[PDB]
């Protein structure tokens, strides 16, 4: 009798508002009615789901204003919400018209409000292999994803349940990738920044980025991860780019050591195969996101990605390049410097009791328990980066900007593998400064550009802390030798270079370790004016940095 009273469109007036007497009765009291529906649940929901095509907003408000009370008083009449949910999540075939095409959007928000309630009031239970109305509600969600009618901000509370939808295999996952890609290519800007700041377009876009970060921040998936990383790679940088970095460091440390291999190897296959596209996007995976992810706290010692990269790195490294064409060349070169960056970092944050001793890493590298030193793969690495940065361009003028960055990344790999896994000063000259001049086979011509004029604004402001440094210099300069009372009483792109950091890391390790021959070589190369101005200035800034 009460359900028959409620599900009725009877018009009242305070004048011009019309305010149906189902809605107004459900506005006045709204809770003790829901205790009656608690008193007999089963006929209430079965009869409540009888008219569900006309009285759509009505019964959705009935469910919302019942689950809010069943959620808030969970401190008495316990063991209730589970049976409530596992009963109601069975008859969503009754709903077929709120979320479909030619249907109101506020009713669609109402469906997802019932969704937010059945996934807030209860736990992860109705998710596995057609447990409840999961394949009768997922299609409602998919039709609210593939529709051309929802809003750029009123999906904002509507994407947030992918944590309760990243727990699956394939089959529906393919069309999930499909609906995510189509909402991205109809709801994200094409490359970068093409919306005015302050306006409620660009701000709801950064809210969309924020809620994606909130979703994968807990829900550790490679599922959403290549989907978001493809828009993280469509340009060189983005507008909200640090937020992805903070959330990547946030997703890095959660445990789940096996899933980290999944993230690395999965976005590594999204990077790794042919996939003809532009090279910045085709390398920016391993250039930014993979390095910044596997750098911080992904896994402190991981050899499964670092077991398949044994097979999957040196095969690309030991290659030949075809220079008839650029579109076969640049892909090989970019994935080669990506592999240089990967082995750089993989030797940067690994200890020595697992990789360079006679351990299971080299037992993975070559088949059989090795008596060898562990310096076999690192010997093929060291040889080929030496070949890489000592590869001449004695007539070669094709794509020399990429080969310069390649050569410096090659030496970055070399610096990392030499600064970490041994303790003797033999290689410390022999692979770093012993550069043998047969014909053309030196270092800095081949790995430093030497091809522009560095433009300097001079000392533009703030000489504030440096005056005290100069007065302290005149303190220690006179009072140490022949100090009187006082005496006189009278009246930036060389750093951000991708080059300065590994040198000023290696020498600031090489000090605290033991005229050296490398000191003689850089002693001569700085006062020799046949040498260009460029590496003269750069090794000058080196010497200034490493005091």
């Amino acid at each position: 009798r009460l359900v028959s009273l409620l599900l009725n469109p009877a018009v009242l007036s305070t004048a011009v508002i019309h305010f149906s007497h189902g809605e107004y009765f459900y506005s006045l009291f709204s809770e003790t009615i829901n205790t009656e529906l608690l008193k007999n649940l089963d006929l209430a929901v079965l009869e409540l789901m009888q008219s569900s095509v006309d009285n759509t907003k009505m019964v959705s408000a009935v469910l919302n204003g019942m689950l809010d009370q069943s959620f808030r008083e969970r401190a008495n009449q316990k063991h209730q919400g589970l049976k409530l949910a596992t009963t109601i999540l069975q008859h969503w075939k009754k709903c077929d018209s709120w979320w479909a095409k030619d249907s109101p959007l506020e009713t669609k928000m109402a469906v997802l409000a019932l969704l937010a309630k059945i996934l807030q009031i209860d736990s992860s239970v109705s998710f596995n292999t057609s447990h409840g109305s999961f394949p009768e509600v997922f299609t409602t969600y998919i039709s609210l994803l593939a529709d051309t009618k929802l809003d750029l901000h009123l999906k904002g509370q509507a994407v947030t349940l992918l944590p309760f939808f990243t727990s699956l295999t394939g089959g529906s996952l393919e069309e999930l990738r499909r609906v995510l890609e189509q909402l991205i290519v109809a709801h994200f800007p094409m490359q970068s920044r093409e919306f005015p700041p302050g306006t409620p377009r660009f701000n709801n876009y950064v809210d969309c980025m924020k809620k994606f970060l909130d979703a994968l921040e807990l829900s550790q998936s490679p599922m959403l991860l290549e989907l978001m990383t493809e828009v993280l790679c469509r340009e060189q940088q983005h507008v909200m780019e640090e937020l992805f970095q903070s959330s990547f460091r946030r997703i890095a440390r959660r445990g789940s050591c096996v899933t980290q291999v999944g993230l690395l190897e999965s976005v590594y296959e999204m990077f790794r195969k042919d996939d003809p596209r532009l090279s910045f996007t085709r390398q920016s995976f391993v250039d930014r996101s993979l390095l910044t992810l596997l750098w911080h706290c992904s896994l402190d010692a991981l050899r499964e990605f670092f077991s398949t990269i044994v097979v999957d790195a040196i095969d690309v490294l030991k290659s030949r390049f075809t220079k008839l064409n650029e579109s076969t060349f640049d892909t090989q070169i970019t994935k080669k410097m990506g592999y240089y960056k990967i082995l750089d970092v993989m030797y940067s944050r690994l200890p020595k009791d697992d990789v360079h001793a006679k351990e299971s890493k080299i037992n993975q590298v070559f088949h059989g328990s090795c008596i060898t030193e562990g310096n076999e793969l690192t010997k093929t690495l060291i040889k080929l980066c030496y070949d890489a940065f000592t590869e001449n361009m004695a007539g070669e003028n094709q794509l020399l900007e990429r080969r310069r960055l390649y050569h410096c990344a090659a030496y970055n790999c070399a610096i990392s593998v030499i600064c970490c896994v041994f303790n003797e000063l033999k290689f410390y000259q022999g692979f770093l400064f012993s550069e043998k001049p047969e014909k053309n086979l030196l270092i800095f011509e081949n790995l430093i550009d030497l091809k522009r004029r560095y433009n300097f604004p001079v000392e533009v402001e703030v000489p504030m802390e440096r005056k005290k440094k100069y007065i302290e210099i005149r303190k220690e300069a006179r009072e140490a030798a022949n100090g009187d009372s006082d005496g006189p009483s009278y009246m930036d792109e060389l750093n951000r270079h991708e080059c300065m950091a590994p040198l000023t890391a290696l020498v600031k390790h090489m000090h605290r370790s033991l005229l050296p021959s490398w000191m003689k070589f850089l002693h001569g190369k700085l006062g020799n004016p046949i040498v260009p101005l460029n590496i003269r200035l750069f090794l000058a800034k080196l010497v200034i940095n490493t005091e």
């Binding site: 030193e373 310096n375 000592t390 033999k426 022999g430 012993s434 043998k436 047969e438 086979l441």
Partner: peptide, 9 residues
């Protein structure tokens, strides 16, 4: 060139 650094290991 670097085989002088190979044989010394």
């Amino acid at each position: 060139d670097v085989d002088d650094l190979l044989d010394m290991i």
